[PDB]
Point group: D2
Chain length 485, copies 4
């Protein structure tokens, strides 16, 4: 069996917190309540003075992605181990289909790579990086049979992944038809391409050139544009890696205006800023390079945390896409060649707790919402995950909100040899991680086998995403004026 | 016993909706799950094609209030009956303590009046309409022993209930000390007093004078002021009856800015507008008169519903404070003498469903949040109410979202002889109402006895309200700069 | 000679108003001051109780444009006559170069058509409707030798005039190089194309389909996008025909943010709204059809006037592009075939005075700014026009602000057989119009000859437009961080 | 006579810039034009490579004010000398009438003190620090006979100058009746009083306590409140010393909304920030203390300059109210006793040029608007001052925009022994200052006699301020609905 009783702790769900024990049997939570009996043989995890929360769900990872010449060093095995050590029990990774390549082939290739390696549960989003009848069919198959209800489109990466407004319109229309959510990388790829060309011609080859060629206006513009096209076809939209105040404000305004759109800041944009691109040490600066870039306005991470607290922004991922110091160095003379991507999978939970809960910006319940529950709602497996309740999956973290840990590449479990949060002292430590009903992390040690985690198959038409869309299809149809001919 | 099994319906909570039966025994929900056994003797309510939702909680009523010369016609008995017929199973009414009068006496007087009459559960807020050592002591007693964690302060009603900024500061400080929430009637009472004097001198004695003397700037101003004072003392704030776009925007901005404040639109401001004050029929116009007034900008109710959907605004009441046609007529020659107050207790649920869910602005789950769950969270009895779950109170409504009912003073159960929503066709009908585990409304008929309802005693420091306040007390203390003398 | 002395009136300039006579000799104002001597032979125009203002400058006309199959009925001759009768003494018309056609040929063709016909002064903007080395050269020639410092680009009209973001970037870059201002028609042409296709498939063929296929989000999106690209290249930008609140707000925000951008509402969007597209009479509805469309939110024209008063919006034109009732009827069965364009050249001045000055939104001086002075500043001939002062051109209107005139296609001087402002009672009447130092309109009668007006040759680098751009070129250059290799 | 010909320079007015000489005779500009003849005897000031601009007008000074126990060290003599040396040729100083004291007596006392000492022209605003029939009469006399059209009211300084909302309403009403503009010190005096009491009890006695007791919310709140009351009585309003982003945004929103209100940032809030209150050196920190305080958000001065460039904010003063290092030291142990006030009169022009024009935020013409022209328009002597034109007063500065000067208490002409802009390198130097047609400053040396300057008597109903107010009185009267009784 493996029975666990988590005793003495305070359960924290998105709605409220309460003292109760949690009885885990066979991969599931089978009872939640005060003073539960320890069945003979069951292991007791003593959660006295700890919070018992749903494991974190990272909506946004790229484990071992082949990108910009080289492949990310955190792979599905190490990446999921590092996740677990940081209190994160599921990741959602992007199938980065190449232009002209079958989405089903790319999906198959990702499942073959990840299935034997993941140490925690996971699922996949599929990038739609070109358009045709075939992609159209494949999206339906993915949504109805392969357990994927999220497709990722790019407005940046000109020549590589970018789609133009007419194609986004079509793609978004078909997302709505198959009951998928549309995710977008929202930056203006034409401005980025011109921008970088210009920074290089001016001899600005360092990482400050990377930020200067695509300042936050370029992100805010494409964010509004994506929302507008999606609003025109009544397709639900998800803006991945919101990095800037102005893009966050676009999302905030559109939601207030009743648009079905969700904004996802990431640990990087919540925990540090882009002043690091101006560091005198080139290696240090390059560590932070990713698209969109972190912003040189120091008030950014605090502001994004305030909007995350208030639900202008709704949930978090990390965009974990790591490259070692010697891989980043590929762009020593030209920032367009630094492989883009930062760490976060392991530290997300502590970073958000320290910058969001300890700071007084959000409460512990909103913390659960924005680290697991909302991901489960949008991507369609709530309350199977994201809630401590009978019948839910036993993905559970015992959390110490009072003790601190200092984040350091010297003690972290990620494969990357630096950490963008190097030195940060965070309140909020994952003391014990349970995944699929097994203790996989405790006393600073991991106990898990590659392949122990499972792919989570999801159904389309997630209710949290589609119930308003469908009611608007029914009452928001345009009408003709009846006239004499 | 009275056992009820509600079978075949779809349960709708704030987080998600799911098919399940609900077993009610002894005033409580004792089981929720699929295909439950009907125990011998238990009555089955067939909820096939219906939603099974928590009963509505009206945060804002004034049943039989003696006000402006006369007393409201809907009393605790008829008012709670009408509530039940409209799908609302709890009301929170205001103890309107007079200036210089003991808050404990006023509280006692309200409990004596309401206890033998209420047909559904209820609780009370207490108005703090003057300030002194005695009021200070009485507030502590109310909060610690009398089950009241909400105190109501007025920035309008000059000469009558109004408090100045220094007194609000003190009052708000002491609310924070006793773990109460501060509610405010946010209009500038000095502008209202000057405004009305001016409208009368210009011979504008009709109800249009009532709105013109205190247009929405006057509400927005006092709303910002209340938020600022409350932010200065770190006291949680609740703005009652938000009537206008601009005041709603103040609340929306303050929350985005991380201020602990909640905004409560009411059915009136969600379901109609203030163009009615300009109606050629004086009686018709006077029906809508209340403070703050409904606004002549027709886009108002739709905008307030959009902000309620997005959580800029968080929950709803009705400010039910009804006066018959012949009572309103007291101000035939002078709008300052029309007793202020409109209906809503009965129609709130259908009005919000039609204007909010049927319109596609919010989903059924957000509907439960803004009609019961959030009230229970703020006023500190969740999930005892506001949730369909084992151990919760059996206050449950079987709801038909597809059928319409037309609202009319001819068919309504309120004592008042008109209805501000006269003629409105609403999708969303309460077909069966269960209160304290008894069927009190079914087949258009009420079956309930005055006194059947119970006063709900609450504890202070509601966690949903105070967890951020307390963390800010711990990390947001101002520090001195250490200097050589 | 033709000497005129305008006596007894109050001169109104953009900065202030003052009593003075104005002495006109040889096409120029040669003296302004109190109690001027009447030289023997000079005609006195008695301006007692009248304002003496600079003639209106219409920044935005399409006289006799061949468009959507047919050509506008108001031609350079009738159009300029109608302008004069309405108090407007200069128009700036768009050379609508076709895709692949020489801009110089189109320019020559417009000068040949207009020179022998105009009855008042005029100048030209040139549309850049495709991109290449040749267009690049021609733009330089136009700017340096042909008196044109304004080029017009389209984000709408897919297949016809539309340019993509990379081309706008290049085009805007070259505008900056030649010291021109970039004008943009800011709507998303991909959304319009999809939108219309969809409205037709739903059998919405009436004019309401025209507005519904491109609601204001589509305008606001492209407006932000244009501003962003122009900000990226430091090119000054001008947004023509701002029709909606949301697009106006984009412009307002960008200016507050220090972006060099100007917004131009037109008489149509200041004086009426798009509810007319829903009129039961098809002919009536089609009268209002133009791109972007007038908006069905009735608060629009008032809001645009408030932003024009506050300088969020800076100056006005009419987009005068008129088609008779039988020409509009070309789209009786399909709104995509209604020739787009409304009237305004004649009524602009009275419409803006009535809706802006008489309403109390702006003063008479701001009225001069937004009807002549700012056009002269941006398009680079101030104070030669747009000011009553010694040495300025004698384009002068004697204006009665107190008397009303009702606008009617029955009394107007435009060739079109209807008027979108039909029935409007406007305070503010042009009683006498002086153009090039000659009385061309008085006692309701026109006295002017086709060809009397002159083309105004302008120089590039208008100081009002470029002084900030050039200082930013000097201090806003991006810098490299100096690092060890 | 004293004739001066200023030759070879570029004249810069609010509307445009142009090459011309300026002929000065007898205190007036008597001709402006190219290549003017030098009359025998006239002194030529060679303005080759210089701008010739209207002298600066400082709307906001307190020369030798007795305040908080002691009197400001810059008096009318030294203060006006320092003004002249900085390119400022007029100051408007506040008659600080004490509570219960005759406004006419205070006015007389200020004229007696200033008349024999001023070295440049000046005028006065009168503070209305209490309310009664007598103050009412005195305000009329001041406005009609004493040349004052601006009255200053306080929402801060509880116990000392503060007025409550009902009194502001009355005061603002009477300002409108006498054709005066209402100026307000907009901070919530009740919050300040509580705030400071709290900071002291926590042992925060340093200048950081001064800012922390009244953060920018306290300013923004009172700013909105003042605007609302003034909007209710249709009285034009002027918000003095706007110090914070949020208060500036209130003003910006109200103007966009068509409210007649003007915002005046000062040199301090445009040129430095409130991080200085946290300096380890107490003397340094105390130098910056004034009400409202400078703000610790470093983006503030840049943001205020952007809103000044865009006309959200309209004109500038300095609030010059200086106290020596040993006078500031009066509050060594208690920040409530540091005499409030900073320097600026001398450096305003260079500070604004460097931070506003050199930075690319505004052009030279907007610079003239916000340093002289708008003050002259609002306070009612334009174009007698604020314009280089025939008949205007010869208050003229020859300005070098290319050379820098470093500001230092070691080289400045103010009496105060420190400078809040210490060390700042500003482009933009006043090389020659002409006041009343005499060279009073050249080659770094002053040549002027105490009493040479004149008091400027103004008339009420300034047109720039009142033309919209009066039109709204005529068309914005509320109407009754006509009903059967
Ligand atoms: N961009 C980046 O740096 N991380 C992942 C690649 C992407 O999605 O943009
Ligand atoms: N105002 C009103 O009309 N209803 C209740 C009384 C109040 O709270 O203002
Ligand atoms: N569009 C329109 O209706 N008038 C002129 C053509 C254009 O510029 O769009
Ligand atoms: N406050 C200040 O520091 N300067 C002048 C006094 C005032 O007006 O507030
Ligand atoms: Zn991305
Ligand atoms: Zn990514
Ligand atoms: Zn109230
Ligand atoms: Zn109430
Ligand atoms: Zn156009
Ligand atoms: Zn046009
Ligand atoms: Zn002040
Ligand atoms: Zn002052």
């Amino acid at each position: 069996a493996g029975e666990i009783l988590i005793k003495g702790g305070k359960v924290v769900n998105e709605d409220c917190s309460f003292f109760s024990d949690v009885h885990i049997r066979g991969g599931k939570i089978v009872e939640v309540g005060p003073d539960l009996r320890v069945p003979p043989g069951a292991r007791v995890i003593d959660a006295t003075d700890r919070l018992v929360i749903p494991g974190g769900i990272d909506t946004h990872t790229h484990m071992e992605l082949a990108f910009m010449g080289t492949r990310a060093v955190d792979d599905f095995h190490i990446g999921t181990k590092a996740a677990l050590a940081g209190g994160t029990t599921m990741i959602l990774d992007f199938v980065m289909t190449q232009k002209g390549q079958s989405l089903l082939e790319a999906y198959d290739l990702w499942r073959k790579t990840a299935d034997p390696k993941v140490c925690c549960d996971y699922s996949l989003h599929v990038a739609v990086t070109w358009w045709s009848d075939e992609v159209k069919d494949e999206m339906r198959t993915l949504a109805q049979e392969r357990g994927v209800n999220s497709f990722k489109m790019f407005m940046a990466y000109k020549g590589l992944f970018m789609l133009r407004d007419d194609e986004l319109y079509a793609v978004f229309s078909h997302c709505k038809e198959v009951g998928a959510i549309a995710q977008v990388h929202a930056e203006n790829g034409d401005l980025i391409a011109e921008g970088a060309k210009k920074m290089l011609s001016l001899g600005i080859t360092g990482p400050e050139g990377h930020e200067l060629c695509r300042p936050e206006a370029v992100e805010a513009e494409a964010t509004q544009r994506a929302i507008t096209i999606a609003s025109a076809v009544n397709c639900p939209l998800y803006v991945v890696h919101v990095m800037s105040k102005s893009a966050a404000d676009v999302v905030s305004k559109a939601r207030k205006d009743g648009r079905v759109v969700f904004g996802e800041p990431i640990a990087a944009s919540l925990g540090t800023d882009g002043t690091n691109y101006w560091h005198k040490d080139w290696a240090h600066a390059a560590q932070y390079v990713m698209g969109p870039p972190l912003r040189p306005d120091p008030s950014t991470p605090g502001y994004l945390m305030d909007l995350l607290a208030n639900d202008d922004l709704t949930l978090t991922g990390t965009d974990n896409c790591t490259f070692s110091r010697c891989q980043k160095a590929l762009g020593k003379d030209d920032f367009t060649r630094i492989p883009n991507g930062v760490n976060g999978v392991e530290d997300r939970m502590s970073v958000i707790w320290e910058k969001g809960v300890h700071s007084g910006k959000m409460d512990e319940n909103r913390f659960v919402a924005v680290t697991s529950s909302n991901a489960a709602k949008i991507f369609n497996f709530y309350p199977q995950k994201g809630r401590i309740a009978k019948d839910s999956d036993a993905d559970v973290v015992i959390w110490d909100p009072k003790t601190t840990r200092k984040i350091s590449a010297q003690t972290h479990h990620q494969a990357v040899d630096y950490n963008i949060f190097e030195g940060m002292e965070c309140h909020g430590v994952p003391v014990v991680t349970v995944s699929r009903g097994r203790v996989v992390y405790e006393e600073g040690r991991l106990k898990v086998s590659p392949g122990q985690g499972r792919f989570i198959h999801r159904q389309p038409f997630s209710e949290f995403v589609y119930k308003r869309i469908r009611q608007r299809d029914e009452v928001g149809k345009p009408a003709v004026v009846i006239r004499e001919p």
